[PDB]
Amino acid sequence: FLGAAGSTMGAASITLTVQARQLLPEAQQHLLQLTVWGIKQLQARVLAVERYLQDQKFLGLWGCSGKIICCTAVPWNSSWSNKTFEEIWNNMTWIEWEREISNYTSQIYDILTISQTQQEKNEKDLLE
Amino acid sequence: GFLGAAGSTMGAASITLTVQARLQLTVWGIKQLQARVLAVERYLQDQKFLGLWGCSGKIICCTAVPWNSSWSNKTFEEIWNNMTWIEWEREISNYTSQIYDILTISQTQQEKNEKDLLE
Amino acid sequence: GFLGAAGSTMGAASITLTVQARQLLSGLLQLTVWGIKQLQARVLAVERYLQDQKFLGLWGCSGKIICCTAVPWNSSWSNKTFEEIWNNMTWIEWEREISNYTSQIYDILTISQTQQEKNEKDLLE
Amino acid sequence: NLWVTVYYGVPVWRDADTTLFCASDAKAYETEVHNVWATHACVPTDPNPQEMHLKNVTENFNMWKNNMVEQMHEDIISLWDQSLKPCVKLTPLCVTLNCTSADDVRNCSFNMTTELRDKQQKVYALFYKLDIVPIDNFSEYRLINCNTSVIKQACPKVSFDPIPIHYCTPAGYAILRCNDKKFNGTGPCKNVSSVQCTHGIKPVVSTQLLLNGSLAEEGIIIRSENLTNNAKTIIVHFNESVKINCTRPSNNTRTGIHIGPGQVFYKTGDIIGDIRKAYCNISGAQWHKVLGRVANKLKEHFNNKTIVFKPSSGGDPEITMHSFNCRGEFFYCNTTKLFNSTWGTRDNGTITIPCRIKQIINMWQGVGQAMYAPPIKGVIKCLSNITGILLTRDGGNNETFRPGGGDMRDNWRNELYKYKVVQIEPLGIAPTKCKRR
Amino acid sequence: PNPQEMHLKNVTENFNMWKNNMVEQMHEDIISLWDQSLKPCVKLTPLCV
Amino acid sequence: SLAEEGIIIRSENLTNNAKTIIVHFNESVKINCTRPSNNTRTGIHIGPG
Amino acid sequence: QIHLVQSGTEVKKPGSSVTVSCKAYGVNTFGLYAVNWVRQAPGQSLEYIGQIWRWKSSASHHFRGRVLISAVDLTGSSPPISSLEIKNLTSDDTAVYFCTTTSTYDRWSGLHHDGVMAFSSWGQGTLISV
Amino acid sequence: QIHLVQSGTEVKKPGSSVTVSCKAYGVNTFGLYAVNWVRQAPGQSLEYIGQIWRWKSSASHHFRGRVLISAVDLTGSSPPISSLEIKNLTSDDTAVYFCTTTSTYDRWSGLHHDGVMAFSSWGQGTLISV
Amino acid sequence: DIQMTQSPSTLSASTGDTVRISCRASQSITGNWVAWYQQRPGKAPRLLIYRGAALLGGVPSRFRGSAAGTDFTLTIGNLQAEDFGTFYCQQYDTYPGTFGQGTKVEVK
Ligand SMILES: *[C@@H]1O[C@H](CO)[C@@H](O[C@@H]2O[C@H](CO)[C@@H](O[C@@H]3O[C@H](CO[C@H]4O[C@H](CO[C@H]5O[C@H](CO)[C@@H](O)[C@H](O)[C@@H]5O[C@H]5O[C@H](CO)[C@@H](O)[C@H](O)[C@@H]5O)[C@@H](O)[C@H](O)[C@@H]4O)[C@@H](O)[C@H](O[C@H]4O[C@H](CO)[C@@H](O)[C@H](O)[C@@H]4O[C@H]4O[C@H](CO)[C@@H](O)[C@H](O)[C@@H]4O[C@H]4O[C@H](CO)[C@@H](O)[C@H](O)[C@@H]4O)[C@@H]3O)[C@H](O)[C@H]2NC(C)=O)[C@H](O)[C@H]1NC(C)=O
Ligand SMILES: *[C@@H]1O[C@H](CO)[C@@H](O[C@@H]2O[C@H](CO)[C@@H](O[C@@H]3O[C@H](CO[C@H]4O[C@H](CO[C@H]5O[C@H](CO)[C@@H](O)[C@H](O)[C@@H]5O[C@H]5O[C@H](CO)[C@@H](O)[C@H](O)[C@@H]5O)[C@@H](O)[C@H](O)[C@@H]4O)[C@@H](O)[C@H](O[C@H]4O[C@H](CO)[C@@H](O)[C@H](O)[C@@H]4O[C@H]4O[C@H](CO)[C@@H](O)[C@H](O)[C@@H]4O[C@H]4O[C@H](CO)[C@@H](O)[C@H](O)[C@@H]4O)[C@@H]3O)[C@H](O)[C@H]2NC(C)=O)[C@H](O)[C@H]1NC(C)=O
Ligand SMILES: *[C@@H]1O[C@H](CO)[C@@H](O[C@@H]2O[C@H](CO)[C@@H](O[C@@H]3O[C@H](CO[C@H]4O[C@H](CO)[C@@H](O)[C@H](O)[C@@H]4O)[C@@H](O)[C@H](O[C@H]4O[C@H](CO)[C@@H](O)[C@H](O)[C@@H]4O[C@H]4O[C@H](CO)[C@@H](O)[C@H](O)[C@@H]4O)[C@@H]3O)[C@H](O)[C@H]2NC(C)=O)[C@H](O)[C@H]1NC(C)=O
Ligand SMILES: *[C@@H]1O[C@H](CO)[C@@H](O[C@@H]2O[C@H](CO)[C@@H](O[C@@H]3O[C@H](CO[C@H]4O[C@H](CO)[C@@H](O)[C@H](O)[C@@H]4O)[C@@H](O)[C@H](O[C@H]4O[C@H](CO)[C@@H](O)[C@H](O)[C@@H]4O[C@H]4O[C@H](CO)[C@@H](O)[C@H](O)[C@@H]4O)[C@@H]3O)[C@H](O)[C@H]2NC(C)=O)[C@H](O)[C@H]1NC(C)=O
Ligand SMILES: *[C@@H]1O[C@H](CO)[C@@H](O[C@@H]2O[C@H](CO)[C@@H](O[C@@H]3O[C@H](CO)[C@@H](O)[C@H](O[C@H]4O[C@H](CO)[C@@H](O)[C@H](O)[C@@H]4O)[C@@H]3O)[C@H](O)[C@H]2NC(C)=O)[C@H](O)[C@H]1NC(C)=O
Ligand SMILES: COc1cnc(-n2cnc(C)n2)c2[nH]cc(C(=O)C(=O)N3CCN(C(=O)c4ccccc4)CC3)c12
Ligand SMILES: *[C@@H]1O[C@H](CO)[C@@H](O[C@@H]2O[C@H](CO)[C@@H](O)[C@H](O)[C@H]2NC(C)=O)[C@H](O)[C@H]1NC(C)=O
Ligand SMILES: *[C@@H]1O[C@H](CO)[C@@H](O)[C@H](O)[C@H]1NC(C)=O
Ligand SMILES: *[C@@H]1O[C@H](CO)[C@@H](O)[C@H](O)[C@H]1NC(C)=O
Ligand SMILES: *[C@@H]1O[C@H](CO)[C@@H](O)[C@H](O)[C@H]1NC(C)=O
Ligand SMILES: *[C@@H]1O[C@H](CO)[C@@H](O)[C@H](O)[C@H]1NC(C)=O
Ligand SMILES: *[C@@H]1O[C@H](CO)[C@@H](O)[C@H](O)[C@H]1NC(C)=O
Ligand SMILES: *[C@@H]1O[C@H](CO)[C@@H](O)[C@H](O)[C@H]1NC(C)=O
Ligand SMILES: *[C@@H]1O[C@H](CO)[C@@H](O)[C@H](O)[C@H]1NC(C)=O
Ligand SMILES: *[C@@H]1O[C@H](CO)[C@@H](O)[C@H](O)[C@H]1NC(C)=O
Ligand SMILES: *[C@@H]1O[C@H](CO)[C@@H](O)[C@H](O)[C@H]1NC(C)=O
Ligand SMILES: *[C@@H]1O[C@H](CO)[C@@H](O)[C@H](O)[C@H]1NC(C)=O
Ligand SMILES: *[C@@H]1O[C@H](CO)[C@@H](O)[C@H](O)[C@H]1NC(C)=O
Ligand SMILES: *[C@@H]1O[C@H](CO)[C@@H](O)[C@H](O)[C@H]1NC(C)=O
To answer: Which sites does the entry annotate for glycosylation (chain D) (predicted)?
Structure first.
């Protein structure tokens, strides 16, 4: 859930424990009707379910599987970004960063998938 | 959710948990649609909690949180040898929210520490 | 979930199994005729994924494409050796061949996962 | 070296549109009084506020493009239709009425169907002059909507009492509230706070004056789409409420006639006592004070000219008169005395404005689908605030500000001007030095 | 499909028949099935004469 | 939509005389249809509304 | 739609001052809009001058202390108006001037970035020579 | 429904040729069906000759180079017809013959496996002795 | 504080040909913060491309742009008289947002 979004990336990274804690509801009451209000709840349920399922579907394919801080062995290519760790984590907010690197999200996702599946294949070889 | 073995003490039932599991609008058709969403919604909720605490698909999940005696006062033998599951969950029904929060915080703290080790 | 590369044998398709996940993203409030069909379609997909992920999860693979399970092979389920299973038999052909022993395989996998879970707690004391 | 790391739960959002459901208060409406608005089905009862203050975050808000107002307009039109679908048809009543040529009742004589299809009956009813239109002693007359709409009786039990409805958002979406004083709903907003969903809002509708609404914080503030075009209406929001008390004092009766198998048309009945027409009382001093403040505020944004308020020119009876319902009967009061002072003597006497009640209501900006409201059988008395006026400019020095109304969306813009739904995007990618798995 | 009944052993439950919601659901479902089946049918209003 | 290489006759049972034969054409034949004489529409009010 | 208008051509002399007013027909308000001032010397490349953004005015170093920015939004008779006037004019200010706009309602569009932005609409332009 | 009818019986002598043709009333087409030729024996178990499957003729290793198989599906007046020809006739050919069909529309049924299939519907049979 | 140059400054062109114009930046504009203008003789410049490759509304589709590190290019295919003019390249990454040197296209 959104909150304290004005802080920089470094300041808000140590407060991610608060965001995750305290239940990171409504519309759970069964109705079984077709009135004006009876259909909007039925659609809201599906909207929430699809959103959460899509997010967890994207998360799983990279080997994160429900962890907030997901580390990956994918090198950083300078074409996606130039700025150093300080200029990224000291004077830039998350909205600013995600707007800056919005042209290289698809490639990042694809590369993460390649890396995960290649790492998965390497292990089977070691086991044999 | 295995009903059956619900009148046994906690230790016995724990051993026997070998296996966990396995449009039109008309009066019946709407009811069937509501029944589907109810199940999907329910499964997701338990999974969301389990995963946040780090359990992720294990029927028995070990957690690092210590036990505070202000939740319970009894010994391991009293709790496991003579209390059924519906009695224990009713006996500690006032400290589930705090327990959930403590496990979430502990999982996040463990998650943060590992990044430090990796540098 | 892939269609395409169905003709090839296991040895060819498995190399591109990585590609199946790799290349792509992979995987109403109206009572009109089209609107209800859309509602049913949305529920069908969510429900299917969750059933598939629920089946995958109980064996402890937890959302990974190739999962190794410590379950020995029973000669009642099949006879052919690794070369003649993975060199000239397609996936559809194999899944049609061993369609009488999927339930037993699932049950054995679940029991083995539960036993491994129990054996882990003992080590931790 | 740096390596891609993935975070779930980062603070990022983008503007979006959703389906916002309804939540009402604790008291379930299964009290045997069922409203047109179906508040009882708004089963999501509202447990707690849960607000968070976004700090150092600025947002841009434009009230005229909000989709929240557009959704409400549709939901309210639909709830009304749903309520009147199982109600008496009223088609037998479109017949020639023989009314005495000797508001005003003119009671008339008509022939109507009895329960047995073969037989006919002659019935007499008191019909308000506003709803009967002459067709060309004892001259003939016809009902007003005979030629353009089908009229359906309101079901008697249903209550038109307006109760608060809170609109709420599904998970993955949030509502943002501006929290800024004097916020003419357009421009950057400083202390945006994340609210779970909107506060209680009453689905009341009125033409010329807004009754029972929310009050501003700092002062009287003007809000309009384009402050240059004369075809756009100006909405004023007050920071203090004038009080209007309205009553129909006669003691009337309801008598029911059977127009078919199982169908009853309830007609008006003879009065006992014959009190004067309904009026409405509005404190003169407070009204003139708030009118002077509004005049000064208008002088601020309109070149420091002299502001003249004039009475409404003409149109449908809704547009030219103040319109509302006291206890289920809509009556339209004459508001000339309230708006005639060129503000930049003031009379302190209680102002009493005449009201003429009507019965056959017509749909706003639509074709067909009229409604009939039965009598109440008792005396009525409702007390209300007024916290807004709607005015529309006439130009071709001084300025002419004709009172306006009729658009049913504009009644809620003073209550939904400070909300904006934003989709939440939790995923994010950032570089750091962990490099494993 | 094939029934699966499992005996709960050493478990006692309390039952009150007059508070069951299962009976209340049935009453509404049967009232609504009859209404749906007779909605597309001849009106019969000319008969009262 | 025209077929790709040749005229194709498709039918459910080429033996039964009670089954229709559908023919698909490689190329199209063009038909132009018109009602030459222009008329007027006038509306009569048969009820309220 | 959107249309911009400025004053006419004016011929001044050194040591004087000149005024240029911008009037936008289509900009609902300057609260969620921005106006950028740009100068084009004859043949030379376009040059940036200054802006007012969220009712905050500023200018580049080459024009700091020598340029003035003001703006008034919707009025009952007049459209939003922005003004630029040179102070202590010198012989090097002989160039055309232009009034620009952009839309700032959505962060995710890509026409603005932390106050530095492109220019969606351009005025006809006024010529000032000395 | 499904019904099979073959030709009549023949009595011949060695060094000749004879053909038996089955006419299936119920097979929509041989494209998604298959015809299996099986020869019963005077006292022994049944044997396999060959088949037409997706219009790909084949025969057993003990009948290759002698037996020929052809088939024509639905026509305007006649039902699908499949035929077997025995060339270089001998005393060992004194046995009944059958023409059989099994459905091939679904892979997952279990009536066929990689071209080697069961025998669902059987004809009456034609005794041939020499 | 950030400068750019573009070449060719003046280039001949003919109807039906495809022209490629490139503007080079001093630094690495990894955010794709580059915009293109075209002005007719004695006319104010008009925005055509923003964020490297995004078309505006009511713009011919023959204008195309590609962004990669330091090399930003604008490709115009099937030129017309409505398309001859003077072109500009701008970066808006660091305050102040400056302009390019200025390139002109002449017929034949
Ligand atoms: C909805 O609700 C919201 C919220 O309430 C509401 O928003 C409000 O809108 C108001 C508009 O209606 C708005 O008020 C205007 O604000 C303007 C911004 O003013 C700021 O900047 C100026 C300039 O800043 C310079 O200079 C100062 C001092 O020199 C310096 O300290 C600064 O740092 C800055 O210098 C920097 O830039 C220089 C270049 O400019 C550079 O050289 C320097 O080196 C340095 O880098 C400050 O002076 C202010 O104090 C503010 O900080 C403001 O400009 C504008 O003033 C005009 O209107 C006033 C009346 O309201 C007049 O009194 C005033 O004189 C201005 O009028 C002149 O301009 C108009 C426009 O052309 C012209 O027509 C007039 O005739 C008049 O011209 C005469 O004066 C000018 C000199 O100004 C001469 O050049 C002419 O020749 C004439 O002589 C307004 O005051 C308000 O801020 C805003 N509030 C909020 C909270 O958002 C919104 O309007 C509502 N919506 C609706 C529809 O109503
Ligand atoms: C919908 O649209 C689709 C797409 O168009 C359409 O599909 C088409 O359907 C067609 C049918 O309508 C189909 O055409 C038939 O194909 C038959 C298969 O032919 C193949 O096999 C034969 C035999 O193969 C043998 O022999 C050769 C040479 O000796 C050898 O090289 C082979 O390897 C194989 O030998 C193997 O088996 C032997 C035993 O069988 C063994 O001894 C060998 O050692 C070896 O192991 C080949 O000859 C072909 O070249 C093909 O490769 C085909 O048999 C059939 O031919 C019949 O019809 C023709 C006219 O179309 C005639 O010209 C021809 O003579 C056949 O007619 C005989 O059979 C009928 C059956 O009753 C009989 O009535 C006739 O009188 C005649 O019999 C007489 O002659 C034979 C000798 O030939 C004698 O034995 C008899 O005793 C009689 O004297 C068809 O040509 C087409 O393939 C198909 N297309 C596709 C792409 O799938 C579909 O039909 C449409 N649907 C509808 C409803 O319209
Ligand atoms: C709130 O409501 C107000 C009132 O409705 C509204 O203001 C009006 O906005 C419209 C735009 O929607 C304005 O119309 C434009 O006006 C300009 C300037 O006209 C002024 O000057 C003339 C002459 O002195 C006066 O007669 C006039 O009254 C104004 O004072 C015109 O130049 C525009 O012309 C364009 O449209 C023509 C068709 O009408 C076309 O011929 C052509 O497209 C014109 O643009 C062309 O101009 C260029 C030259 O500069 C040319 O080179 C190009 O090829 C280009 O195509 C247009 O008529 C109207 O004047 C405004 N009126 C007032 C009183 O303000 C607000 O806009 C509205 N606010 C919002 C937010 O919607
Ligand atoms: C497309 O449409 C066509 C036309 O409708 C259709 O062709 C016809 O199919 C039907 C089957 O549905 C065929 O009817 C069968 O025909 C056989 C063959 O009879 C031949 O010989 C007689 C006598 O010489 C002729 O009169 C006849 O025309 C044929 O040439 C019959 O043997 C079948 O008899 C069964 O039906 C009897 C009732 O009529 C029952 O008493 C009994 O079930 C018979 O079967 C029994 O026979 C066994 C002995 O052999 C016995 O032991 C078993 O108990 C078994 O039950 C039946 O009448 C008809 O002939 C076809 N006609 C033509 C011109 O083709 C196609 O089938 C259809 N295609 C598709 C895909 O649907
Ligand atoms: C970085 O990402 C952004 C997206 O966040 C991206 O901006 C997008 O660029 C595409 C490519 O030009 C834009 O798509 C065009 O938009 C215009 C707007 O009017 C349309 O007219 C275009 O349609 C024409 O072309 C189509 C294909 O030929 C035709 O089918 C059609 O009929 C039209 O002729 C086209 O859709 C898109 O609008 C922007 N998005 C935004 C929000 O601006 C940007 O390009 C990326 N950066 C880089 C360097 O690629
Ligand atoms: C009353 O107008 C209808 C009449 N009839 C129907 N019908 C439904 N079924 C059929 C056949 N007609 C209607 N449906 C929706 C209707 C409306 O929402 C609608 O216009 N307003 C909402 C209620 N309101 C008022 O309170 C109000 C205030 C001051 C004066 C008069 C009325 C008017 C506006 C509607
Ligand atoms: C909002 O209401 C307050 C009082 O409720 C008004 O405050 C008074 O305003 C008048 C004239 O504006 C002043 O003479 C008084 O001194 C004010 N009272 C106090 C206590 O300060 C205020 O005017 C209202 N808002 C507007 C825009 O008029
Ligand atoms: C950046 O490097 C990655 C390797 O991690 C590569 O896949 C990608 O294509 C590179 N980017 C470009 C624009 O070549
Ligand atoms: C962000 O970068 C600028 C570079 O000019 C630097 O001056 C500033 O201090 C940085 N922000 C913080 C919080 O250090
Ligand atoms: C017991 O411990 C928990 C956390 O370990 C703490 O929240 C709680 O307050 C403790 N109880 C007491 C009585 O201190
Ligand atoms: C548990 O307690 C009850 C009563 O306190 C006692 O009867 C029972 O024997 C105890 N359990 C065991 C295993 O002894
Ligand atoms: C499949 O098996 C057969 C016999 O077991 C063998 O002849 C054939 O070569 C195998 N397929 C491949 C591709 O080697
Ligand atoms: C009404 O019906 C009566 C029949 O009882 C008839 O006599 C009378 O004329 C009718 N009214 C009119 C106006 O015709
Ligand atoms: C925004 O509103 C909150 C509560 O109304 C207040 O505490 C805060 O100070 C306000 N923001 C500013 C910048 O004053
Ligand atoms: C309206 O009623 C209230 C309370 O009953 C009263 O205080 C007020 O004075 C009344 N209005 C007038 C104009 O008297
Ligand atoms: C409004 O009403 C009268 C009627 O025309 C008008 O002349 C006058 O200006 C206003 N009333 C008073 C009391 O001033
Ligand atoms: C059908 O049309 C194509 C070209 O459109 C032609 O080549 C072909 O011969 C036609 N079919 C027949 C059966 O002639
Ligand atoms: C044909 O008749 C229609 C209807 O009167 C009319 O609108 C139209 O103009 C006529 N056309 C000609 C060619 O007269
Ligand atoms: C000359 O220029 C300076 C700087 O712009 C200005 O402040 C000063 O007032 C001007 N003085 C004269 C003589 O105009």
So the answer is: 56, 111, 137, 245, 251, 304, 340, 348, 398
Alpha-carbon distance E19 to nearest alpha carbon in chain D (angstroms)? 19
- CA-wise closest residue to I3 among I96, I67, I81: I96
Structural domain range at position I36: 4-107
B117 contacts chain D (CB < 8 A): no
CB D158 within 8 A of CB D36: yes
Alpha carbon distance H52, E23 (integer Å): 63
Query: Which residues from chain G sit within 8 angstroms of residue A96, using beta carbons?
Result: 114
Tokens in use for G115? 């106050």
Angle at the Cα of D286 (from D284 to D290), degrees rounded to 5?
Answer: 115
Domain that holds residue H11: 3-127
- The domain total for chain H is 1
Question: What's the DSSP call for residue D39?
Answer: G
Compare all CA atoms of chain B with the CA of A66 and give the residue at the minimum distance. B51
Chains C and H touch, contact meaning at least 3 pairs of CB atoms under 8 angstroms apart: yes
How were these coordinates obtained? cryo-EM
**Phi, then psi, of H51 in degrees rounded to 5:** -160, 160
Q: Give the number of whichever ligand sits closest to the CA of residue D337.
A: 16
CA distance D32 to C16: 66
Helices and strands counted in chain C (H then E): 6, 0
Q: How far apart are CA B97 and CA B100, in angstroms?
A: 5
Phi, psi of E20 (to 5 degrees): -65, 135
Number of domains in chain I: 1
User: Which residue bears the tokens 């029911």?
Assistant: D256
Spell out where I1-108 has E strands: 4-7, 10-13, 19-25, 34-39, 46-50, 54-55, 63-68, 71-76, 86-91, 103-107
∠ Cα D184 D185 D191 (to 5°): 100
| Beta strand segments in D129-192, E | 132-134, 140-143, 151-153, 166-168, 173-177, 186-189
Structure-derived torsion over alpha carbons of residues D340, D345, D346, D351, reported in degrees to the nearest 10: -60
Q: What is the DSSP string of B8-75?
A: SBHHHHHHT---------SHHHHHHHHHHHHHHHHHHHHHHHHHHTT-TT-SS----PPPPTTT--S-
Chain A touched by C23 (CB under 8 Å): yes
Number of inter-chain CB pairs under 8 A, A vs I: 12
Instruction: For chain B, list the contacting chains (3+ Cβ pairs, <8 Å).
Output: A, C, D, E
**Could you tell me if I32 lies within 8 Å of chain A, comparing CB atoms?**
yes
Pairing of strands D52-53, D173-177: unpaired
| Cis peptide bond N-terminal to I8, omega within 30 | yes
Burial (0-12, 13-18, 19+ Cβ within 10 Å), D314:
exposed
Q: CA gyration radius for chain D?
A: 26
Q: Do I51 and G47 touch (CB under 8 A)?
A: no
Q: How far is CA A52 from the centre of its chain?
A: 10
Q: Which of G50, G27, G53, G56 is nearest to G37 (CA)?
A: G50
CB D306 within 8 A of CB D397: yes
**CATH number reported for the structural domain that contains residue H68 in this entry:** 2.60.40.10
Report d(CA D259, CA D89) in Å as an integer: 10
The bridge status of strand D151-153 relative to strand D370-372 is: parallel
User: B–A contact (≥3 CB pairs within 8 Å)?
Assistant: yes
At I22, which CATH number?
2.60.40.10
Chain D residues with beta carbon closer than 8 angstroms to that of E48: 115-117, 261
Residue C15: phi and psi, rounded to 5, are: -65, -40
Q: Does D118 touch chain E (CB under 8 A)?
A: yes
Dihedral sign of CA atoms D335, D338, D340, D343 in order: negative
Element (H, E) at D80: helix D67-84
Starting from the CA of residue I36, give the closest ligand. 5
Q: Is the Cβ of B112 closer than 8 Å to some Cβ of chain A?
A: yes
Which residues in chain C are closer than 8 Å to H108, comparing Cβ atoms? 96, 99
